[PDB]
Design a protein around this ligand. Structure first.
Ligand code: HEM
Ligand code: HEM
Ligand code: HEM
Ligand code: HEM
Lengths: 141, 146, 141, 146
């Protein structure tokens, strides 16, 4: 579970993201498409070309959800319920792919927050993404 | 493969005893039931609302036979699964959009079906060899993804 | 989350295991060692040879814990506190490994409980080992 | 190892700017901090109780440098990782008993470390080259397990 320390860490690092969340969301996707091409099978309907607006559009949505989980760090299961439902019932993304995105999100943050991406923060952000992923996957079976 | 002549023979010999028709239907159906999310690829099949509805669905059973068929033929090119599944690998990526992870889920289901079916006969050493083949097959199938 | 049907299924299946749980624990380890040899790295102090009393004994231990979990299917977290501790702070087995033992356990039950290893029972046991896995790795970090 | 020439050039160009001493200490330290279970191999290293205790531990720093040392050599034989890493694979298996999953975690951490250091220079495409590399190395390090 996430500790007070963890919560402070996450709010802090995410705090810094501010208004760039959108762009950092799009970048994490691109990174994921490039490094783990198998993830592409879920977006056959998307234009995955560099600077794709669909990707831009999608990065923003993902970012908003993360931003929402941070705002509700003490009630994520509830704050994310709807999204947990969508993923379990419609999208049905195989669970293994959450860890890939998580990973690309962490690289993206690292690449943008050198001052904040400390060992302690890194660990907190990793536990956090892991928790989001678990919520999103909780209603799979 | 990195199969030992001994490992090759164990695989080969148990398979000789397999009814692909039944094992194929059961393996694919168990998949749709254990890991409900794999049903995303079979909406056109019908009602998969229950174990029963899945296990009974003829469309599933028939796809199951098509899949183990292909698998079965792959066991004859155990020394070049890559080349045997190349076109099937492309199809799966480019046409079907099947996440390769699915190949691994099935493989594990396959092993449970074999154990289920052969009880005693499906010994630790025999499972080990099968685990190497399912892994091998999955890799072969995922090989052309880009 | 284990449904009531699930809890039912599990207790039935395990009900049938009976006095053979120990032999099945022992058999599952043997299958694990052979199929996923990387798992052996955690047992350097064991004689991993076929029929070894160390393996036999360990098999019993694992089986018993499972029993205990089936029995407290409603309060796993609590029923397995000690074990979650041990694994998180002493053993420190990597989480990936739990999936391998779980798998070898299904395979073992399937090979021994044909009539009982129905598709619905298969699904429940899987979920069950999953939860047991989650409990045992919950205090990792 | 499907490193296209351009992927190989990219790996190599960046590796030129790395201070292996430094990166080594950071990657290892961070592994012990993000996945504390990995600390199981270092009970003779002393105090690993907090991030500062880990990151500043003279032993972790020293070992990190060693590890990365071996890794850098690996980067000059991208053609023969398996060959390059064979005696090391055996040692990790037979003497150290290190679960190979450890090799993948470090790979991921190392990728975050490179992102941390190069910022914007660690482009999507460079990361994908490095992903193939860390994977190739972990695979080579696991090749001799039995
Ligand atoms: C923590 C990780 C994730 C978060 C926060 C997240 C969040 C979201 C959100 C907010 C949406 C849009 C739903 C809407 O239309 O309102 C979405 C859609 C979607 N997500 Fe997830 N997701 C995550 C992981 C994944 C992963 C790992 C994949 C596959 C690799 C995935 C595949 C999809 C797909 C295919 C859609 C539908 C997009 C469209 O058709 O526009 N998601 N996700
Ligand atoms: C042992 C691994 C597998 C093998 C050998 C295999 C083989 C095949 C073959 C031979 C076909 C026939 C299609 C054609 O030739 O046009 C096919 C189609 C297909 N497979 Fe795979 N398959 C495997 C795994 C999977 C899995 C695990 C899934 C999803 C759970 C999947 C989803 C599909 C789908 C959706 C089709 C399309 C059939 C249609 O047109 O309705 N396959 N596969
Ligand atoms: C289904 C999940 C598991 C359960 C219920 C379980 C249960 C147990 C139990 C009951 C013990 C004995 C405690 C004692 O000695 O008093 C134990 C110890 C141990 N377990 Fe876990 N275990 C599980 C998964 C694993 C896995 C997957 C591994 C590694 C691949 C593992 C590695 C160990 C080791 C190395 C020991 C200590 C052996 C010894 O020195 O006697 N466990 N576990
Ligand atoms: C890129 C992956 C790695 C490389 C290239 C590597 C390289 C090395 C080298 C060169 C040595 C010293 C050899 C000797 O003592 O003769 C060593 C030792 C060792 N490695 Fe690895 N290593 C890697 C990953 C890891 C990881 C991820 C862990 C544990 C989480 C680990 C655990 C150890 C341990 C415990 C020792 C023994 C140190 C001592 O007590 O003297 N290694 N490694």
């Amino acid at each position: 579970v996430l500790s007070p320390a963890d919560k402070t860490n996450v709010k802090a690092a995410w705090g810094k993201v501010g208004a760039h969340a959108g762009e950092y969301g799009a970048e994490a996707l691109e990174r994921m498409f490039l490094s783990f091409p198998t993830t592409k099978t879920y977006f056959p309907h998307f234009d995955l070309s560099h600077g794709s607006a669909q990707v831009k559009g999608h990065g923003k949505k993902v970012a908003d959800a993360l931003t929402n989980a941070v705002a509700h760090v003490d009630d994520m299961p509830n704050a994310l319920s709807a999204l947990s439902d969508l993923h379990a019932h419609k999208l049905r993304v195989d669970p293994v792919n959450f860890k890939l995105l998580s990973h690309c999100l962490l690289v993206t943050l690292a690449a943008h927050l050198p001052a904040e991406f400390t060992p302690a923060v890194h660990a907190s952000l990793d536990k956090f993404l892991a928790s989001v992923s678990t919520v999103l996957t909780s209603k799979y079976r | 493969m990195h199969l030992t002549p001994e490992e090759k023979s164990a695989v080969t010999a148990l398979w000789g005893k397999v009814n692909v028709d039944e094992v194929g239907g059961e393996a694919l159906g168990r998949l749709l039931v254990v890991y409900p999310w794999t049903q995303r690829f079979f909406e056109s099949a019908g009602d998969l609302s229950t174990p029963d509805a899945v296990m009974g669905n003829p469309k599933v059973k028939a796809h199951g036979k098509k899949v183990l068929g292909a698998f079965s033929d792959g066991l004859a090119h155990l020394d070049n699964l890559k080349g045997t599944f190349a076109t099937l690998s492309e199809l799966h990526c480019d046409k079907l959009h099947v996440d390769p992870e699915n190949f691994r889920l099935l493989g594990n289901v396959l092993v449970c079906v074999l154990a289920h079916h052969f009880g005693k006969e499906f010994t630790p050493p025999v499972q080990a060899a099968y685990q190497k083949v399912v892994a091998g097959v999955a890799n072969a199938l995922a090989h052309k993804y880009h």
